[PDB]
């Protein structure tokens, strides 16, 4: 992309891990606050949410400098310069779930004696389906 | 088995790994959907943020069970039952990533000659501290009443 090629550096992989670090803690925090919002804490769910805000932030800043820098995406290793790209990086990570994570995480609940977990994981490996199922749908009106 | 205790098990670590991808996935798709806006694809964006809110409700439910199973943060390996303690992880990561993480990876950018980069890093850098000391400021308030 627009700067200097990533590709091979210690760089390229310290802005992948944070994206990973940056993603887990606004999801963190707004899990945090719908707690504080539950006991009667406003102020305190207030900085979570806003703080959270700024972890959208730098995970976006992330992303642009893996864009920038002809880096791939953190989370399927597929480009995402163009929005068609973006698109294929979706489709791949949800195929990946539907057709390998979530089934394989059901049958090791199942074998470990948590059924529950199970169904669970069960209906997010239908919910993934659905979701690549969609965005195949969009990549379709996209090249046409 | 016994679903409160799932320390130890394969199914501990599918959960962390689970928050891990659906984490990543939610900012993905919000990040797409801004290109969507700009191109003028209000459906796509719109689909996009609505599949986010799939990819909340699936990191979340994973946390329940991470909590419920008596296992720690996937982020920091604290435990994250009661708010007190939800806030401790929060300053614990905090004061990780300030401290350690994006200092050196501000270094390391600087030495490969990415001065841009190692100028983001090192504005994260000091946005973490100013978030551990909002949240030390929480813990001070929630422990002395
Ligand atoms: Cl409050
Ligand atoms: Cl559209
Ligand atoms: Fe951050
Ligand atoms: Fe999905
Ligand atoms: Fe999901
Ligand atoms: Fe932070």
Redesign the pocket.
């Given at each position: 992309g627009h700067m200097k090629d990533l590709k091979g550096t210690k760089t390229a992989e310290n802005l992948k891990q944070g994206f990973i670090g940056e993603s887990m803690a606004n999801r963190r925090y707004l899990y945090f606050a719908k707690r504080?919002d539950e006991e009667g804490?406003?102020?305190?769910?207030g900085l979570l949410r806003s703080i959270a805000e700024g972890e959208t932030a730098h995970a976006f800043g992330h992303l642009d400098f893996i864009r920038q820098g002809g880096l791939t995406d953190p989370a399927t290793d597929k480009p995402i310069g163009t929005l068609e790209q973006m698109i294929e990086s979706a489709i791949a990570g949800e195929t990946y779930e539907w057709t390998q994570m979530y089934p394989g995480f059901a049958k090791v609940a199942r074998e470990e004696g948590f059924p529950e977990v199970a169904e669970w994981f069960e209906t997010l490996a239908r919910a993934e389906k659905s979701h690549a199922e969609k965005f195949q749908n969009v990549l379709k009106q996209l090249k046409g």
């Open positions: 504080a804490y406003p102020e305190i769910a």
